[PDB]
Design a protein around this motif. Structure first.
Motif, PDB file in Angstrom:
ATOM      1  N   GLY A  46       0.818  -1.190   0.000  1.00 34.40           N
ATOM      2  CA  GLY A  46       0.000   0.000   0.000  1.00 34.40           C
ATOM      3  C   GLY A  46       0.858   1.248   0.000  1.00 34.40           C
ATOM      4  O   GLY A  46       2.010   1.247  -0.456  1.00 34.40           O
ATOM      5  N   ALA A  50       5.099   1.714  -0.427  1.00 32.87           N
ATOM      6  CA  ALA A  50       5.647   2.595  -1.453  1.00 32.87           C
ATOM      7  C   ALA A  50       6.525   3.691  -0.849  1.00 32.87           C
ATOM      8  O   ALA A  50       7.616   3.970  -1.353  1.00 32.87           O
ATOM      9  N   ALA A 127      -8.236   3.707   3.270  1.00 35.11           N
ATOM     10  CA  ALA A 127      -8.532   3.408   1.874  1.00 35.11           C
ATOM     11  C   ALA A 127      -7.577   2.325   1.367  1.00 35.11           C
ATOM     12  O   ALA A 127      -6.790   1.746   2.123  1.00 35.11           O
ATOM     13  N   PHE A 154      -3.908   8.230  -5.603  1.00 34.37           N
ATOM     14  CA  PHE A 154      -3.109   7.608  -6.654  1.00 34.37           C
ATOM     15  C   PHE A 154      -3.954   7.248  -7.869  1.00 34.37           C
ATOM     16  O   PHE A 154      -3.536   7.469  -9.013  1.00 34.37           O
ATOM     17  N   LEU A 158     -10.551   6.588  -9.181  1.00 37.20           N
ATOM     18  CA  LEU A 158     -11.118   6.828  -7.858  1.00 37.20           C
ATOM     19  C   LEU A 158     -11.250   8.316  -7.573  1.00 37.20           C
ATOM     20  O   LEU A 158     -12.235   8.758  -6.970  1.00 37.20           O
TER      21      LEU A 158
HETATM   22  O1  LIG Z   1      -6.002   5.325   0.113  1.00 38.04           O
HETATM   23  C1  LIG Z   1      -4.666   5.435  -0.333  1.00 38.04           C
HETATM   24  C2  LIG Z   1      -4.581   4.726  -1.711  1.00 38.04           C
HETATM   25  N1  LIG Z   1      -3.171   4.473  -2.020  1.00 38.04           N
HETATM   26  C3  LIG Z   1      -2.239   5.470  -2.396  1.00 38.04           C
HETATM   27  N2  LIG Z   1      -2.657   6.764  -2.366  1.00 38.04           N
HETATM   28  C4  LIG Z   1      -1.752   7.724  -2.734  1.00 38.04           C
HETATM   29  N3  LIG Z   1      -0.491   7.539  -3.125  1.00 38.04           N
HETATM   30  C5  LIG Z   1      -0.116   6.255  -3.139  1.00 38.04           C
HETATM   31  N4  LIG Z   1       1.152   5.805  -3.505  1.00 38.04           N
HETATM   32  C6  LIG Z   1       1.202   4.436  -3.414  1.00 38.04           C
HETATM   33  C7  LIG Z   1      -0.040   3.968  -2.976  1.00 38.04           C
HETATM   34  C8  LIG Z   1      -0.906   5.113  -2.794  1.00 38.04           C
HETATM   35  C9  LIG Z   1      -5.373   3.336  -1.507  1.00 38.04           C
HETATM   36  O2  LIG Z   1      -4.409   2.395  -1.059  1.00 38.04           O
HETATM   37  C10 LIG Z   1      -6.009   2.876  -2.812  1.00 38.04           C
HETATM   38  C11 LIG Z   1      -5.306   2.158  -3.781  1.00 38.04           C
HETATM   39  C12 LIG Z   1      -5.912   1.745  -4.973  1.00 38.04           C
HETATM   40  C13 LIG Z   1      -7.246   2.071  -5.180  1.00 38.04           C
HETATM   41 CL1  LIG Z   1      -8.046   1.581  -6.643  1.00 38.04          CL
HETATM   42  C14 LIG Z   1      -7.984   2.785  -4.250  1.00 38.04           C
HETATM   43  C15 LIG Z   1      -7.352   3.183  -3.075  1.00 38.04           C
END
Ligand SMILES: OC[C@@H](Nc1ncnc2[nH]ccc12)[C@H](O)c1ccc(Cl)cc1
Length: 167
Positions: A46, A50, A127, A154, A158
């Motif tokens: 997640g 990263a 999330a 990301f 979404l």
């Molecule tokens: O809520 C945080 C989200 N993840 C990230 N958000 C921002 N920057 C990021 N960099 C690496 C991962 C990451 C979540 O994991 C997520 C992942 C995929 C989908 Cl479809 C929906 C939600």
């Protein structure tokens, strides 16, 4: 005035952008980047996996020393550690992980940690792999955080659903 760029303004203090939080933090070098942590600070996947990869595992090394000294965090809790090459500080915040059966009500407590910092770059808590509805997470964020929060989402698909459905 700050250097955050390309965000949509949802409220007085909450902003949102389709961006990789890793790449955002490297560009902005914010005072505080929020990690989507677990209680053990095991940054395996997640957002946490990263961010830790971007620090060349230095985040994990620091975190293991923190846990050895202090023990696990609480669900809903946080700790401030180094931001390494990404930010001045990293606020490790534990939102409930629905895929572990944790109480979603603790999501508000998790977001309350943000109020101890005037400006933050952050993901939506609980999330992604933590299994909560990102729309609900955004609602709790807006209704809980009073300091200035820049949310990086990301997934482009979404992001559009969060904007279009925002009340
Ligand atoms: O809520 C945080 C989200 N993840 C990230 N958000 C921002 N920057 C990021 N960099 C690496 C991962 C990451 C979540 O994991 C997520 C992942 C995929 C989908 Cl479809 C929906 C939600």
């Amino acid at each position: 005035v700050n250097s955050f760029s390309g965000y949509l303004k949802l409220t007085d203090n909450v902003y949102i952008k389709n961006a990789d939080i890793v790449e955002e933090a490297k560009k902005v070098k914010p005072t505080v980047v929020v990690n989507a942590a677990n209680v053990y600070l095991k940054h395996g996947g997640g957002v946490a996996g990263a961010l830790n990869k971007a620090t060349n595992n230095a985040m994990q090394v620091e975190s293991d020393d923190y846990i050895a000294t202090n023990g696990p965090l609480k669900v809903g809790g946080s700790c401030v550690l180094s931001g390494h090459n990404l930010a001045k500080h990293c606020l490790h915040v534990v939102g409930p992980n629905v895929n572990k059966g944790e109480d979603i009500q603790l999501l508000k407590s998790a977001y309350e940690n943000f109020n101890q910092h005037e400006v933050l770059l952050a993901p939506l808590l609980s999330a992604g792999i933590f299994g909560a509805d990102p729309i609900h997470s955004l609602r709790v964020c807006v209704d809980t955080v009073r300091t200035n929060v820049y949310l990086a989402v990301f997934d482009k698909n979404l992001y559009d659903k969060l904007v279009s459905s925002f009340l």
